[PDB]
């Protein structure tokens, strides 16, 4: 993911909003995220694996557009992960057009 500059959007089909800005490797460095499974997590039978990750598997392989039980749909998964951390840490973009940048 060194060439990533926005979050993948093909799984959404027609977009409402601009692709979310996300230079993956520069973001993770600036945010000080060392564990890949901060995002690329492995949930099995309601248990979060502490020492595994799902690097290489798209979020959309496990997160349909619609919610399934307590597995969030794909929009909700991104918002909870991305906007959820920014709100928890009080750092990074928490307004809609600061992620979904019109440029
Ligand atoms: C989820 C894929 C996700 C997105 C999208 C996202 C975007 C984002 C931007 C565009 C910035 C500003 C520029 C930059 O890349 O530094 C930013 C900044 C921070 N983020 Fe973020 N972010 C996503 C996810 C996450 C997650 C899961 C965390 C916390 C675990 C996280 C944290 C942060 C932090 C901290 C910052 C500030 C960086 C700095 O300038 O200090 N983000 N994010
Ligand atoms: C930990 C250092 C880490 C690794 C390693 C890593 C790898 C990685 C790859 C190989 C991909 C796919 C790139 C491609 O398609 O060419 C990828 C994609 C995404 N990642 Fe990642 N990633 C690591 C860490 C993190 C962290 C900490 C976050 C959350 C802030 C994160 C996020 C994402 C997202 C979003 C994508 C796109 C997923 C998709 O659906 O294709 N990664 N990562
Ligand atoms: C891709 C980086 C990706 C994102 C974004 C994402 C988000 C996400 C959230 C925010 C939740 C809610 C719980 C939590 O905060 O962790 C969640 C829940 C589930 N996930 Fe996920 N997820 C991403 C990637 C993946 C991948 C690649 C898998 C499949 C291997 C996956 C699976 C799941 C499952 C299952 C859940 C539900 C957990 C539970 O409550 O039982 N995620 N995801
Ligand atoms: C502010 C409340 C806000 C809105 C509105 C919004 C909308 C939105 C939609 C409708 C989607 C689905 C795809 C589409 O464009 O149709 C979506 C997807 C993602 N979002 Fe978002 N979003 C708002 C807020 C935020 C913030 C503050 C962030 C960044 C932390 C963010 C990120 C993302 C990501 C990642 C996705 C999936 C990939 C993409 O579509 O770019 N959103 N959002
Ligand atoms: As670097
Ligand atoms: As929120
Ligand atoms: As809250
Ligand atoms: Zn390189
Ligand atoms: Zn851009
Ligand atoms: Zn750098
Ligand atoms: Zn790993």
Curated annotation (Swiss-Prot):
UniProt keyword Signal present: yes
Any GO molecular function: heme binding
Superkingdom of the organism of origin: Bacteria
A Gene Ontology biological process term: anaerobic respiration
Residue positions binding heme 4: 79, 96, 99-100
Keyword Hydrolase included in the entry's annotation: no
Binding site for heme 2: 41, 59, 62-63
GO CC terms of this entry: periplasmic space
Residues reported to bind heme 1: 24, 36, 39-40
Post-translational modifications reported in the UniProt record: Binds 4 heme groups per subunit.
Protein keywords: Electron transport, Heme, Iron, Metal-binding, Periplasm, Pyrrolidone carboxylic acid, Signal, Sulfate respiration, Transport
Name of the protein in its database record: Acidic cytochrome c3
Residues of the full protein shown: 26 to 127 of 127
